[PDB]
């Protein structure tokens, strides 16, 4: 919990206020373009279930991963920015992303 994007955003979005979460990805694309992936390339999810979808294009993402030296209360994150295809699992109506399955 210091100044770097992952430590800041993980805190603000209530992911590390009461625990240190090991890894989390943030997508820097408009919400409706991320929701548009639910009608893009259908693929199997890691768990075999088939409600996962892979984006046609790469998207700007930041991976946040806890350092070996991180301990609650002072979570610490390595920040890695990349452009990757995201795979999300979709449910509901409207069919919207409910889980991040990976980036590729």
């Amino acid at each position: 919990s210091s100044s770097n994007y992952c430590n800041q955003m993980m805190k603000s979005r209530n992911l590390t206020k009461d625990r240190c979460k090991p890894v989390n990805t943030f997508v820097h694309e408009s919400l409706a373009d991320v929701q548009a992936v639910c009608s893009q390339k259908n693929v199997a999810c890691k768990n075999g279930q088939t409600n996962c979808y892979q984006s046609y294009s790469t998207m700007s993402i930041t991976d946040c991963r806890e350092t070996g030296s991180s301990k609650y209360p002072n979570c610490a994150y390595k920040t890695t920015q990349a452009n990757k295809h995201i795979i999300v699992a979709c449910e509901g109506n409207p069919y919207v992303p409910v889980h991040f399955d990976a980036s590729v």
Partner: peptide
Amino acid sequence: KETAAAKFERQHADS
């Protein structure tokens, strides 16, 4: 309370 779709957005969207 928070739906699974709202939770995906709070945890992963940075539009």
